[PDB]
């Protein structure tokens, strides 16, 4: 949550969203509609799908090792074997703990960043025609029908042809 | 020859980092010193390890 | 300093700030005032308060181990014991170095992000009534008395009722 | 790529840029010009120049160790030596893999953040005189000659004296 989008200014998730991870809910004269953003969801999923194969490539293959369970008490050599195994176990347990903590932190920051990136991309499409209400939801200042909305979601929103009407609505 | 625990002796000699040998005066009374063999030919004749003294009966 | 708030566009800390970590300094007709933001300070402190218990949970308990100091010179077994202990010490020293470096980097990025998040939250409260002067300080374009300022700090700033006066002051 | 500047809203690198890492391309009445930003490039280079001396300070110095290659087959002690060496090798290989992955991720995020920071600094200089076109390129709304542009790049852009003309050009 480094960017304050998720659990920040969005303030709420959408349990009704099953199409993807990030998406839009629009409301205009025609009526409320909902869609999912495939590009951001795919980017986040792609960055998450591995994330453990990129550090621990795979399981290495160990065949013959030392004895790790002993019946009698020998002394020096058994002490050394027990010490070596305990040291290895402690070091690998620490590696696991730290790796999982780092990966979880980065995953959370990554998804937050994807949400923020989608918000900023949308805000940059609506140059002057819309105002950010602050709850993660844009107020667009002109007649924007479903074709308009799907152009916003598409990334081909033509801001120039609504600029005059939007500016007149905003600043009166 | 044969060195029981050869690895340990090789390790400690290597760690010491020197072959500096100080001859001491050992007094072997009643035995013959400087034994040798034809397997270890020093010069033209029989010999032995230079740091070891083969004591035989006198 | 990934967001450029701290040591970035804020450019200066406040040694006179002792109430919290992040806060506001306002100046209006009545006079200069200063306050601290409790929510951001508490969030940063909460994220920092642990940060070492979450990786190294605690100290594990070791009772009987190998000998680590030797009087005479044995050979193979003493060499192996010395090697095992030296290997463990080197690995744990590297773990300590890397862990501290990572935690420090993340702490710095975290506090920078909290500063940026406070700035963005404030900017989103003042939708069109204020302009970011760029030095981390907002110019509000209307009569904003101490009740107005404490509403900004509160998070209940009502932007709608100053919109006309502010817009008239900005664009003439 | 946590901020979406590089490979995000900039969308393209400049192979013609050899002066520095980050820079400006301006176009006005006089003609197209290009320059590099020395401050951001120097900051990124400074943060990258070390980045491996700060974790692995140097090479430690090892002189006498255990034997790692064996001719005959002894049993317990040779098994223990082989196990110790294999454990050390595996742990250090994991350390190398994780360290390189973390450093690469942070370097990418760092350079992306520097690009975003330069963009935001420039945007804050042009308070109301310019509009972000969204492709990482600003449309300035007034006569801005080469002295104007080099003032923008300098960081001494005087926004107040173009505010009226720019606002008139924007909102008509
Ligand atoms: C979205 O944009 C693409 C290309 O920009 C276009 O082919 C398509 O018809 C648009 N509308 C959709 C996919 O509904
Ligand atoms: C080796 O050194 C010792 C003392 O340093 C000396 O007495 C001896 O003669 C030396 N022998 C040779 C072959 O250099
Ligand atoms: C701040 O807001 C809360 C609730 O929004 C309100 O109860 C309080 O009176 C406000 N002013 C303060 C805490 O000074
Ligand atoms: C840039 O600014 C500095 C100080 O702000 C000034 O001395 C210099 O003349 C300006 N122009 C340049 C470096 O081209």
XYZ file of C-alpha atoms and ligand atoms in Angstrom:
630
model
C 0.000 0.000 0.000
C 2.751 2.444 -0.873
C 0.596 4.453 -3.268
C -2.572 4.662 -1.205
C -4.848 3.470 -3.980
C -5.972 0.137 -2.541
C -7.163 0.575 1.057
C -6.422 4.246 0.429
C -8.525 6.564 -1.701
C -10.499 3.717 -3.284
C -11.716 2.732 0.188
C -13.682 -0.322 -0.920
C -13.415 -3.404 -3.072
C -16.065 -4.747 -5.424
C -17.222 -8.248 -4.557
C -19.485 -8.025 -7.597
C -16.383 -7.838 -9.783
C -15.620 -11.344 -11.045
C -14.526 -10.482 -14.572
C -11.092 -9.221 -13.554
C -9.052 -7.626 -10.811
C -9.358 -3.946 -11.765
C -12.259 -2.374 -13.578
C -14.674 0.493 -14.006
C -18.179 1.245 -12.815
C -19.790 3.991 -14.870
C -23.060 5.835 -14.323
C -24.640 8.123 -16.905
C -28.087 8.995 -18.234
C -28.653 5.569 -19.798
C -27.873 3.701 -16.595
C -25.225 2.168 -14.397
C -22.822 -0.255 -16.042
C -19.772 -2.209 -14.964
C -16.776 -3.606 -16.817
C -13.328 -4.960 -16.024
C -9.972 -3.686 -17.274
C -8.175 -6.594 -18.907
C -4.801 -4.924 -19.443
C -4.111 -4.047 -15.805
C -5.425 -7.371 -14.521
C -3.255 -9.236 -17.015
C -0.195 -7.178 -16.082
C -0.636 -7.842 -12.365
C -1.342 -11.541 -12.933
C 1.714 -11.875 -15.170
C 3.909 -10.256 -12.540
C 2.472 -12.546 -9.847
C 2.304 -15.856 -11.757
C 5.955 -16.664 -11.141
C 7.579 -14.763 -8.310
C 8.945 -17.916 -6.685
C 10.474 -19.689 -9.645
C 12.612 -16.584 -10.202
C 14.496 -17.024 -6.913
C 14.219 -20.712 -6.012
C 14.387 -22.047 -9.566
C 13.437 -25.591 -8.543
C 14.280 -28.318 -6.066
C 17.888 -29.453 -6.131
C 18.445 -33.188 -6.018
C 20.163 -34.702 -2.966
C 20.845 -38.427 -2.777
C 23.363 -39.493 -0.123
C 23.841 -37.304 2.930
C 25.030 -37.554 6.526
C 23.088 -39.397 9.206
C 20.679 -37.122 11.044
C 19.276 -39.509 13.670
C 21.511 -41.355 16.108
C 20.877 -44.207 18.518
C 23.896 -44.200 20.829
C 26.106 -41.335 22.009
C 29.494 -41.144 20.301
C 30.811 -37.686 21.119
C 32.682 -35.312 18.827
C 31.557 -36.602 15.438
C 27.896 -36.925 16.382
C 28.024 -33.460 17.935
C 29.471 -32.068 14.718
C 26.844 -33.767 12.562
C 24.012 -32.519 14.767
C 25.481 -29.016 14.753
C 25.859 -28.956 10.976
C 22.298 -30.099 10.408
C 20.875 -27.655 12.955
C 22.828 -24.789 11.393
C 21.569 -25.664 7.920
C 17.979 -25.941 9.146
C 18.109 -22.589 10.933
C 19.650 -20.816 7.955
C 17.105 -22.232 5.518
C 14.215 -21.433 7.856
C 15.391 -17.832 8.007
C 15.710 -17.777 4.223
C 12.136 -19.007 3.877
C 10.770 -16.486 6.369
C 12.551 -13.513 4.817
C 11.755 -14.569 1.257
C 8.052 -14.951 1.958
C 7.910 -11.626 3.797
C 9.666 -9.793 0.964
C 7.530 -11.408 -1.725
C 4.315 -10.590 0.125
C 5.354 -6.981 0.635
C 6.265 -6.610 -3.016
C 3.049 -8.264 -4.186
C 0.965 -5.864 -2.119
C 2.930 -2.866 -3.386
C 2.663 -4.203 -6.944
C -1.115 -4.550 -6.915
C -1.461 -1.137 -5.278
C 0.761 0.314 -8.001
C -1.332 -1.292 -10.727
C -4.466 0.265 -9.262
C -2.766 3.659 -9.085
C -1.463 3.287 -12.639
C -4.938 2.552 -13.961
C -6.295 5.570 -12.106
C -3.583 7.853 -13.470
C -3.983 6.549 -17.020
C -7.711 7.230 -16.885
C -7.115 10.680 -15.394
C -4.698 11.500 -18.196
C -7.227 10.471 -20.836
C -9.735 12.951 -19.371
C -7.463 15.957 -19.607
C -9.816 18.781 -18.645
C -13.214 17.168 -19.202
C -13.365 15.449 -15.812
C -12.575 16.124 -12.176
C -11.281 13.624 -9.650
C -13.825 13.495 -6.834
C -11.185 12.003 -4.533
C -12.911 8.695 -3.748
C -11.306 7.137 -6.810
C -14.245 8.112 -9.004
C -14.236 10.685 -11.801
C -16.982 13.214 -12.464
C -17.136 13.769 -16.219
C -18.646 17.112 -17.181
C -20.541 16.343 -20.394
C -23.007 14.011 -22.057
C -21.025 10.757 -22.061
C -23.069 7.834 -23.372
C -22.052 4.173 -23.399
C -19.966 4.674 -26.536
C -18.162 7.500 -24.731
C -17.564 5.293 -21.693
C -16.319 2.351 -23.739
C -13.985 4.775 -25.495
C -12.627 5.805 -22.098
C -12.120 2.166 -21.150
C -10.677 1.470 -24.597
C -8.012 4.152 -24.286
C -9.159 6.029 -27.404
C -11.164 8.727 -25.618
C -11.187 11.808 -27.840
C -10.952 14.632 -25.330
C -10.775 17.416 -27.912
C -14.371 17.187 -29.141
C -15.889 17.478 -25.656
C -13.473 20.118 -24.359
C -15.721 23.127 -24.949
C -18.860 21.627 -23.420
C -16.939 20.206 -20.465
C -15.115 23.464 -19.755
C -18.383 25.381 -19.949
C -19.996 22.965 -17.499
C -17.081 23.199 -15.067
C -16.269 26.901 -14.868
C -19.676 28.239 -15.970
C 56.185 -45.882 3.978
C 52.667 -45.329 5.263
C 51.159 -42.502 7.290
C 48.218 -43.449 9.520
C 46.079 -40.309 9.548
C 47.930 -39.029 6.502
C 45.392 -36.271 5.906
C 45.869 -34.809 9.382
C 49.658 -34.666 9.110
C 49.508 -33.172 5.629
C 47.003 -30.589 6.858
C 48.990 -29.517 9.900
C 52.309 -29.400 8.053
C 50.706 -27.313 5.313
C 49.166 -24.984 7.893
C 52.509 -24.563 9.653
C 53.874 -23.145 6.426
C 57.509 -24.115 6.863
C 59.849 -27.081 6.591
C 62.445 -25.576 8.921
C 64.144 -28.501 10.643
C 66.306 -28.033 13.735
C 68.605 -30.970 14.404
C 68.719 -31.967 18.059
C 71.347 -33.992 19.818
C 69.726 -37.350 20.449
C 71.912 -39.884 22.241
C 71.202 -43.418 21.032
C 73.482 -45.625 23.119
C 74.185 -49.195 22.113
C 72.586 -49.074 18.658
C 73.836 -48.480 15.131
C 72.628 -45.240 13.594
C 72.086 -44.055 10.029
C 70.600 -47.255 8.684
C 69.796 -47.294 4.994
C 68.429 -49.369 2.153
C 68.898 -49.801 -1.576
C 65.276 -48.850 -2.227
C 66.118 -45.262 -1.242
C 69.310 -44.536 -3.167
C 70.938 -41.288 -2.057
C 73.939 -40.613 -4.245
C 75.345 -43.823 -5.705
C 74.859 -45.916 -2.571
C 72.112 -46.882 -0.172
C 70.396 -44.211 1.879
C 67.257 -43.244 3.772
C 65.036 -40.313 4.628
C 67.241 -37.406 5.609
C 65.055 -36.427 8.582
C 64.770 -39.941 10.031
C 67.346 -42.117 11.782
C 67.116 -45.872 11.248
C 68.511 -47.464 14.412
C 69.598 -51.094 14.206
C 71.297 -53.430 16.649
C 74.948 -52.818 17.495
C 13.011 8.565 -1.404
C 11.207 6.875 -4.267
C 8.391 9.419 -4.369
C 10.428 12.593 -4.031
C 8.355 14.012 -1.204
C 10.904 13.913 1.612
C 14.195 15.478 0.484
C 12.312 16.125 -2.750
C 9.637 18.761 -3.227
C 9.229 19.376 0.508
C 12.891 20.418 0.658
C 13.000 20.988 4.411
C 12.019 19.400 7.684
C 10.413 21.143 10.642
C 12.486 20.961 13.808
C 9.680 22.880 15.500
C 7.395 19.905 14.886
C 7.367 17.774 18.038
C 3.704 16.795 18.060
C 4.042 14.188 15.321
C 5.961 13.136 12.248
C 3.826 14.725 9.516
C 1.746 17.842 9.879
C 0.495 21.114 8.477
C 1.547 24.731 8.770
C -1.231 27.080 7.710
C -1.169 30.837 7.188
C -4.288 32.940 6.688
C -5.644 36.339 7.700
C -5.912 35.437 11.391
C -2.311 34.282 11.628
C 0.130 31.446 11.198
C -0.715 28.179 12.918
C 0.797 24.719 13.073
C -0.628 21.273 13.752
C 0.391 17.649 13.335
C -1.399 14.928 11.375
C -2.036 12.039 13.740
C -3.293 9.511 11.192
C -0.215 9.508 8.951
C 2.196 9.576 11.887
C 0.375 6.662 13.499
C 0.381 4.694 10.245
C 4.120 5.162 9.738
C 4.888 4.372 13.384
C 2.736 1.238 13.253
C 4.532 0.043 10.138
C 7.919 0.732 11.757
C 7.266 -0.520 15.312
C 7.921 -4.141 14.406
C 9.841 -4.686 11.198
C 12.368 -6.998 12.845
C 10.113 -9.324 14.782
C 8.414 -10.173 11.477
C 11.549 -11.802 10.033
C 13.668 -12.860 13.012
C 10.779 -13.815 15.289
C 13.002 -14.189 18.362
C 16.210 -15.788 19.556
C 16.340 -19.549 19.176
C 17.692 -21.462 22.142
C 20.980 -23.360 21.765
C 22.390 -25.377 24.649
C 25.109 -27.881 23.714
C 27.200 -27.240 20.623
C 30.596 -28.131 19.177
C 33.845 -26.810 20.607
C 34.924 -23.576 18.953
C 38.278 -22.961 20.662
C 41.076 -25.515 20.582
C 44.345 -25.803 22.472
C 46.347 -28.392 20.536
C 46.356 -29.252 16.829
C 44.505 -32.448 15.943
C 44.020 -32.291 12.188
C 40.957 -33.315 10.197
C 38.278 -33.045 12.874
C 39.473 -29.713 14.235
C 39.740 -28.394 10.681
C 36.168 -29.474 10.007
C 34.867 -27.872 13.198
C 36.665 -24.605 12.467
C 35.376 -24.640 8.894
C 31.791 -25.282 9.964
C 31.841 -22.477 12.500
C 33.475 -20.030 10.085
C 30.925 -20.882 7.395
C 28.033 -20.340 9.794
C 29.473 -17.030 10.993
C 29.998 -15.736 7.458
C 26.514 -16.740 6.342
C 24.849 -15.130 9.352
C 26.927 -11.967 8.983
C 25.775 -11.683 5.382
C 22.188 -12.274 6.481
C 22.477 -9.469 9.023
C 24.030 -7.050 6.540
C 21.463 -7.702 3.818
C 18.525 -7.665 6.226
C 19.515 -4.332 7.735
C 20.113 -2.795 4.310
C 16.733 -3.961 3.011
C 14.878 -2.825 6.119
C 16.509 0.605 6.023
C 15.699 1.049 2.347
C 12.097 0.042 2.904
C 11.739 2.287 5.950
C 12.972 5.288 3.986
C 10.653 4.499 1.079
C 7.784 3.942 3.526
C 8.136 7.301 5.259
C 8.525 9.043 1.903
C 5.355 7.311 0.718
C 3.458 8.409 3.815
C 4.471 12.008 3.181
C 3.387 11.736 -0.452
C 0.108 10.096 0.563
C -0.693 12.913 2.968
C 0.091 15.458 0.266
C -2.116 13.702 -2.279
C -4.980 13.283 0.186
C -4.884 16.989 0.979
C -4.695 17.865 -2.718
C -7.735 15.709 -3.408
C -9.723 17.433 -0.670
C -9.060 20.805 -2.338
C -10.430 19.821 -5.716
C -10.364 23.137 -7.571
C -10.152 25.617 -4.696
C -6.375 25.392 -4.297
C -3.236 25.222 -6.399
C -0.083 23.298 -5.587
C 2.742 25.831 -5.449
C 5.267 23.027 -5.945
C 7.226 23.438 -2.701
C 4.798 21.113 -0.945
C 2.566 24.010 0.075
C -0.938 24.736 -1.207
C -2.273 28.167 -2.112
C -5.978 28.203 -1.272
C -7.941 30.776 -3.251
C -10.591 31.964 -0.786
C -11.221 33.223 2.723
C -10.221 30.167 4.768
C -10.342 30.841 8.505
C -9.173 28.522 11.278
C -12.401 26.523 11.102
C -11.770 26.075 7.373
C -8.198 24.946 8.027
C -9.182 22.517 10.770
C -11.783 21.130 8.379
C -9.022 20.551 5.834
C -6.917 18.791 8.456
C -9.992 16.909 9.660
C -10.760 15.488 6.228
C -14.266 16.992 6.096
C -13.401 20.007 3.940
C -16.536 21.004 2.041
C -15.158 22.061 -1.324
C -18.542 22.731 -2.922
C -19.421 25.860 -0.938
C -16.167 27.662 -1.777
C -15.983 26.537 -5.408
C -17.442 29.695 -6.943
C -15.325 32.152 -4.964
C -12.171 30.093 -5.465
C -12.717 29.696 -9.206
C -13.375 33.418 -9.543
C -10.164 34.200 -7.668
C -8.120 31.804 -9.799
C -9.241 32.465 -13.364
C -10.547 36.020 -12.844
C 8.172 -0.165 -13.244
C 6.152 0.609 -10.142
C 5.337 4.159 -11.213
C 4.470 3.516 -14.842
C 6.750 6.207 -16.206
C 9.296 4.063 -18.041
C 7.534 1.527 -20.280
C 4.375 3.229 -19.034
C 3.169 6.650 -20.112
C 6.490 7.581 -21.730
C 6.085 4.616 -24.087
C 9.409 5.055 -25.869
C 13.074 5.640 -25.214
C 15.343 8.034 -27.081
C 18.269 6.330 -28.776
C 19.352 9.788 -29.910
C 19.906 10.712 -26.266
C 23.590 10.203 -25.471
C 24.134 13.209 -23.224
C 22.431 11.674 -20.198
C 19.803 9.241 -19.009
C 16.809 11.576 -18.645
C 16.199 14.704 -20.648
C 13.834 16.975 -22.516
C 12.824 17.402 -26.130
C 11.175 20.760 -26.729
C 9.404 22.083 -29.813
C 8.381 25.710 -30.255
C 8.247 28.335 -32.994
C 12.033 28.559 -33.344
C 12.461 24.823 -33.816
C 12.895 21.462 -32.173
C 15.664 21.152 -29.608
C 16.908 18.460 -27.263
C 18.791 18.526 -23.976
C 19.579 16.177 -21.110
C 18.756 16.627 -17.427
C 21.992 16.323 -15.481
C 20.525 16.301 -11.973
C 18.262 13.272 -12.410
C 20.870 11.330 -14.374
C 23.470 12.042 -11.702
C 21.082 11.010 -8.926
C 20.255 7.698 -10.601
C 23.906 7.006 -11.430
C 24.961 7.790 -7.862
C 22.349 5.413 -6.488
C 23.459 2.694 -8.924
C 27.256 3.127 -8.778
C 27.602 1.074 -5.613
C 24.676 -1.179 -4.815
C 26.878 -4.240 -4.347
C 29.604 -2.878 -2.121
C 26.878 -1.919 0.365
C 25.912 -5.549 1.040
C 28.960 -7.646 0.142
C 31.573 -5.150 1.319
C 34.470 -7.074 -0.238
C 35.969 -10.534 -0.495
C 36.884 -12.112 2.817
C 40.248 -13.826 2.956
C 40.369 -17.607 3.448
C 43.691 -19.423 3.681
C 43.522 -22.957 5.100
C 40.293 -24.906 4.772
C 39.062 -28.498 4.712
C 39.788 -30.868 1.847
C 37.080 -30.779 -0.800
C 38.300 -33.490 -3.192
C 38.947 -37.042 -2.044
C 40.650 -40.000 -3.685
C 39.609 -42.993 -1.583
C 36.420 -43.647 0.389
C 36.771 -43.229 4.147
C 33.217 -43.046 5.449
C 31.854 -40.784 8.172
C 34.416 -37.984 8.082
C 34.498 -37.704 4.300
C 30.700 -37.757 4.245
C 30.619 -34.933 6.775
C 33.138 -32.852 4.834
C 31.247 -33.332 1.573
C 27.971 -32.467 3.289
C 29.381 -29.314 4.867
C 30.806 -28.080 1.589
C 27.621 -28.866 -0.342
C 25.517 -27.070 2.269
C 27.737 -23.994 2.118
C 27.662 -23.963 -1.684
C 23.875 -24.261 -1.823
C 23.349 -21.529 0.754
C 25.714 -19.123 -0.992
C 24.185 -19.872 -4.392
C 20.767 -19.014 -2.994
C 22.186 -15.837 -1.471
C 23.604 -14.822 -4.843
C 20.369 -15.550 -6.695
C 18.169 -13.666 -4.239
C 20.569 -10.737 -3.941
C 20.803 -10.256 -7.693
C 17.032 -10.520 -8.105
C 16.384 -7.961 -5.367
C 19.013 -5.552 -6.665
C 17.673 -5.764 -10.214
C 14.111 -5.166 -9.061
C 15.163 -2.181 -6.991
C 17.279 -0.737 -9.800
C 14.351 -0.906 -12.204
C 12.009 0.681 -9.663
C 14.645 3.324 -8.895
C 15.111 4.422 -12.497
C 11.349 4.434 -13.029
C 10.989 6.598 -9.924
C 13.623 9.028 -11.168
C 11.751 9.404 -14.446
C 8.489 9.986 -12.583
C 10.170 12.473 -10.247
C 11.512 14.486 -13.164
C 8.068 14.496 -14.756
C 6.390 15.644 -11.548
C 8.996 18.337 -10.904
C 8.476 19.721 -14.396
C 4.697 19.560 -13.991
C 4.939 21.484 -10.735
C 7.027 24.206 -12.365
C 4.280 24.729 -14.967
C 1.514 25.327 -12.468
C -1.358 26.362 -14.729
C 0.487 27.354 -17.903
C 0.742 23.825 -19.297
C -1.337 20.687 -19.660
C -0.085 17.122 -19.490
C -0.962 15.491 -22.803
C -0.606 12.060 -21.197
C 2.199 10.690 -23.386
C 4.764 12.198 -21.035
C 4.853 15.440 -23.007
C 3.585 18.833 -21.855
C 1.636 21.285 -23.992
C 2.606 24.786 -22.876
C -0.025 27.398 -23.675
C 2.022 30.503 -24.499
C 4.922 31.862 -26.507
C 7.829 29.959 -24.943
C 11.116 30.649 -26.721
C 14.448 28.933 -26.098
C 15.129 31.134 -23.075
C 11.748 30.061 -21.692
C 12.560 26.398 -22.314
C 16.013 26.621 -20.758
C 14.374 28.286 -17.767
C 12.039 25.302 -17.483
C 14.989 22.923 -17.653
C 16.920 25.146 -15.250
C 14.220 25.020 -12.588
C 13.766 28.808 -12.488
C 10.672 28.968 -14.698
C 8.713 32.071 -13.716
C 5.123 30.912 -14.036
C 3.570 34.145 -12.778
C 4.414 36.312 -15.793
C 2.845 33.925 -18.317
C -0.192 33.015 -16.210
C -2.631 35.424 -17.856
C -1.719 34.575 -21.446
C -1.652 30.845 -20.721
C -5.002 30.876 -18.925
C -6.550 32.863 -21.762
C -5.221 30.363 -24.296
C -6.514 27.388 -22.311
C -10.028 28.364 -21.262
C -10.680 30.960 -23.992
C -11.531 -0.315 -29.047
O -10.419 0.182 -29.792
C -10.014 -0.683 -30.863
C -8.765 -0.080 -31.460
O -8.435 1.149 -30.828
C -11.150 -0.830 -31.873
O -10.751 -1.737 -32.894
C -12.411 -1.340 -31.187
O -13.504 -1.329 -32.098
C -12.746 -0.466 -29.974
N -13.961 -0.911 -29.291
C -14.195 -2.070 -28.639
C -13.082 -3.085 -28.585
O -15.280 -2.290 -28.110
C 67.880 -25.248 8.154
O 67.788 -24.246 9.160
C 68.437 -24.588 10.391
C 68.165 -23.453 11.349
O 67.467 -22.392 10.712
C 69.924 -24.810 10.143
O 70.549 -25.215 11.354
C 70.119 -25.872 9.071
O 71.500 -25.990 8.752
C 69.345 -25.502 7.815
N 69.474 -26.543 6.810
C 69.429 -26.299 5.497
C 69.579 -27.490 4.603
O 69.272 -25.168 5.053
C -13.512 16.652 13.016
O -14.441 15.751 12.412
C -15.173 14.962 13.362
C -16.006 13.987 12.566
O -15.851 14.199 11.169
C -16.009 15.870 14.261
O -16.679 15.074 15.232
C -15.123 16.898 14.952
O -15.922 17.834 15.666
C -14.264 17.638 13.921
N -13.406 18.649 14.539
C -12.385 18.482 15.408
C -12.049 17.077 15.839
O -11.756 19.444 15.836
C 20.340 28.582 -14.790
O 20.129 29.044 -13.455
C 21.326 29.501 -12.811
C 20.953 29.832 -11.385
O 19.562 29.648 -11.162
C 21.906 30.693 -13.570
O 23.123 31.092 -12.950
C 22.159 30.326 -15.026
O 22.553 31.479 -15.761
C 20.895 29.727 -15.650
N 21.086 29.372 -17.057
C 21.906 28.444 -17.595
C 22.771 27.638 -16.659
O 21.947 28.265 -18.808
